Amino acid sequence: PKTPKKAKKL
Amino acid sequence: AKKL
Amino acid sequence: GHMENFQKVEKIGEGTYGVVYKARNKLTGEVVALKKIRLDTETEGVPSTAIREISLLKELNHPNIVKLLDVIHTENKLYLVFEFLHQDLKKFMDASALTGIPLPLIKSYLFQLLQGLAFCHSHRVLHRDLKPQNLLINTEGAIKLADFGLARAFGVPVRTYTHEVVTLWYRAPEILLGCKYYSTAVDIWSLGCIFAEMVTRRALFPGDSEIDQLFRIFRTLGTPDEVVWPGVTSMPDYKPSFPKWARQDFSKVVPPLDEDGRSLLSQMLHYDPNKRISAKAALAHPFFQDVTKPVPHL
Amino acid sequence: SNEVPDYQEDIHTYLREMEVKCKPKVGYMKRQPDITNSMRAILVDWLVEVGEEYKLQNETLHLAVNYIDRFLSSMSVLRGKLQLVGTAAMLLASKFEEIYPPEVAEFVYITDDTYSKKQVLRMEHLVLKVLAFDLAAPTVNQFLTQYFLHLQPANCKVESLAMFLGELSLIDADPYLKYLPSLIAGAAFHLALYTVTGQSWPESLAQQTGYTLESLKPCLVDLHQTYLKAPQHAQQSIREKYKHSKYHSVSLLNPPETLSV
Numbered sequence: 001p002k003t004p005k006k007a008k009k010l
Numbered sequence: 011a012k013k014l
Numbered sequence: 015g016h017m018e019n020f021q022k023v024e025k026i027g028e029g030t031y032g033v034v035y036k037a038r039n040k041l042t043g044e045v046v047a048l049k050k051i052r053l054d055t056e057t058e059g060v061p062s063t064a065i066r067e068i069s070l071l072k073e074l075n076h077p078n079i080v081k082l083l084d085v086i087h088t089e090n091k092l093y094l095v096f097e098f099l100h101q102d103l104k105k106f107m108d109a110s111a112l113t114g115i116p117l118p119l120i121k122s123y124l125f126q127l128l129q130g131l132a133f134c135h136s137h138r139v140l141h142r143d144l145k146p147q148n149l150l151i152n153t154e155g156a157i158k159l160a161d162f163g164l165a166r167a168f169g170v171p172v173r174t175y176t177h178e179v180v181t182l183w184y185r186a187p188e189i190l191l192g193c194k195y196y197s198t199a200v201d202i203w204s205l206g207c208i209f210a211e212m213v214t215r216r217a218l219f220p221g222d223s224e225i226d227q228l229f230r231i232f233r234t235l236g237t238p239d240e241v242v243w244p245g246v247t248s249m250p251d252y253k254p255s256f257p258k259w260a261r262q263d264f265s266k267v268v269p270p271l272d273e274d275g276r277s278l279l280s281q282m283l284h285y286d287p288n289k290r291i292s293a294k295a296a297l298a299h300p301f302f303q304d305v306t307k308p309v310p311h312l
Numbered sequence: 313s314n315e316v317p318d319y320q321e322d323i324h325t326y327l328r329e330m331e332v333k334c335k336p337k338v339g340y341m342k343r344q345p346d347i348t349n350s351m352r353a354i355l356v357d358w359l360v361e362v363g364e365e366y367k368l369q370n371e372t373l374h375l376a377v378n379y380i381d382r383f384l385s386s387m388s389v390l391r392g393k394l395q396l397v398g399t400a401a402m403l404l405a406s407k408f409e410e411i412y413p414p415e416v417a418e419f420v421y422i423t424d425d426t427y428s429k430k431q432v433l434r435m436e437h438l439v440l441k442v443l444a445f446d447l448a449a450p451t452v453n454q455f456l457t458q459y460f461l462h463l464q465p466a467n468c469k470v471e472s473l474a475m476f477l478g479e480l481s482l483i484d485a486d487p488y489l490k491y492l493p494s495l496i497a498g499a500a501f502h503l504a505l506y507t508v509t510g511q512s513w514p515e516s517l518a519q520q521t522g523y524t525l526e527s528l529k530p531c532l533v534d535l536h537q538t539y540l541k542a543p544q545h546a547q548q549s550i551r552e553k554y555k556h557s558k559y560h561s562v563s564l565l566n567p568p569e570t571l572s573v
């Protein structure tokens with residue numbers, strides 16, 4: 001289980 | 011865009 | 015001290031955000047965990063995750079929250095220096111997988127996690143990444159919240175925050191369903207998942223995608239409707255075509271748990287974030303009446 | 313679908329403790345050899361415009377100002393570097409507060425290349441060092457949003473007007489550095505409520521905050537004057553911002569001529 005990354009803007 |  | 019004063023012992027960890035060494039202070043002998051953050055790869059300066067992690071950890075002084083000892087900030091590098099703890103709860107669970115964690119220890123760990131979390135919430139901090147690998151245990155029976163890199167100071171009332179937060183297996187249904195607002199209830203959901211996982215020795219909702227995660231929850235807790243969760247059918251990611259599954263009896267879900275344990279778990283897993291149990295209220299639950307602090311077997 | 317109740321009282325108590333600890337030194341500007349309250353006003357007014365251009369939260373603006381005042385409390389700064397301090401402060405506030413902080417190259421752009429990327433990043437490091445990474449400061453904004461909960465049902469016009477008044481306080485270090493954010497928020501809330509509905513600071517808020525209407529008076533006298541004189545002030549960005557319909561055009565509302573008080 002890997003911590004999620006902020007989705008790219010737009 | 012401004013130089014103060 | 016400073017960088018030349020630390021002797022690196024072993025690499026104990028990595029995660030989406032950082033690289034962690036066990037290290038010792040060459041002058042005082044103190045054993046620490048060094049979380050190394052690379053600025054050079056960063057042409058955007060200090061990462062938002064590190065800024066939040068540091069500022070918030072410095073405000074949170076509690077027996078159940080990992081202690082930040084120092085921060086070493088160079089032009090090229092950022093080191094966070096933490097107290098060193100024996101291992102994380104994931105590694106403990108794995109080592110306990112055949113035997114099981116004794117019930118008194120499970121109750122102790124959950125009680126302590128709730129104390130740490132209640133302290134966070136009372137300090138307007140959401141953790142947002144609670145899972146076993148982010149929880150640290152020592153040899154004396156303590157467990158502590160760690161890994162604050164996803165944490166955020168929250169407003170009263172909250173506004174829309176980052177949609178991509180909790181690790182999938184631990185992620186609350188209001189996030190999966192795309193709610194524009196979430197709050198402290200998301201951490202309680204994560205802890206509920208971890209509680210169940212300590213009891214059954216396996217992840218409660220091991221989804222392999224967001225839809226699979228959602229359906230695993232529905233299959234266990236029943237597909238929610240307007241009655242159990244007002245507003246649910248209006249959530250951005252809800253579809254009326256979702257299969258409608260009946261809720262299972264917790265005797266099937268968490269067989270080893272007594273009546274009090276099942277009651278507490280069901281309240282931590284309540285669908286409606288507004289009615290989900292708070293960390294503070296959970297601490298007052300009858301389940302914890304007998305709570306002790308046993309030593310783990312390591 | 314917001315829920316705040318179980319830890320809400322604790323949060324308010326904690327923020328009241330931290331605003332004292334995060335307060336800038338009130339008299340710091342007299343110890344700055346080269347910069348003045350007027351330069352600071354120009355800087356903050358510009359940050360308002362930057363926040364609008366980048367669609368940043370009001371909270372980000374309030375934090376940046378707190379960072380600036382705390383940095384200038386211990387660091388002498390020449391006038392030609394003041395915008396660099398402000399820019400780094402806004403970048404840090406954005407990183408703390410926003411989902412999407414603008415990239416450093418954008419902050420460089422918005423100064424019209426007055427400073428380089430290297431300078432902005434080096435200044436970020438210095439500000440972090442000087443503030444010892446203590447970035448989670450209470451703001452007038454955080455207290456306002458808690459106060460707003462005492463209006464049932466919500467009044468969006470009162471909220472907009474209160475935010476406007478709270479933001480105007482950022483511009484003028486004299487008088488507003490004398491007051492804690494919770495007290496400024498209280499004066500702004502009352503003044504806004506009174507202007508819009510004719511009502512007054514509610515007993516529920518007097519109980520929670522410990523501030524009687526009486527204890528808000530000195531700050532209220534100041535804020536009322538500031539409100540009356542806003543169309544004449546050299547700095548106009550906040551008024552322009554709050555003319556917009558998203559704010560219910562509250563900056564176009566006429567202030568009450570007198571306070572019942």
Ligand SMILES: Nc1ncnc2c1ncn2[C@@H]1O[C@H](COP(=O)(O)OP(=O)(O)O)[C@@H](O)[C@H]1O
Nearest residue numbers: 027028029030031032047096098099102147161
């Ligand atoms: N203070 C500590 N003591 C012992 N091990 C730690 C400590 N901090 C982190 N670790 C180990 O390193 C791993 C990664 O650390 P974490 O702070 O969670 O980084 P990331 O944000 O990259 O996941 C953890 O899962 C844990 O097993």
Ligand SMILES: [Cl-]
Nearest residue numbers: 104145146147
């Ligand atoms: Cl894990």
Ligand SMILES: [Mg+2]
Nearest residue numbers: 029147148161
């Ligand atoms: Mg981690």
Ligand SMILES: [Mg+2]
Nearest residue numbers: 031161163164
């Ligand atoms: Mg992390």
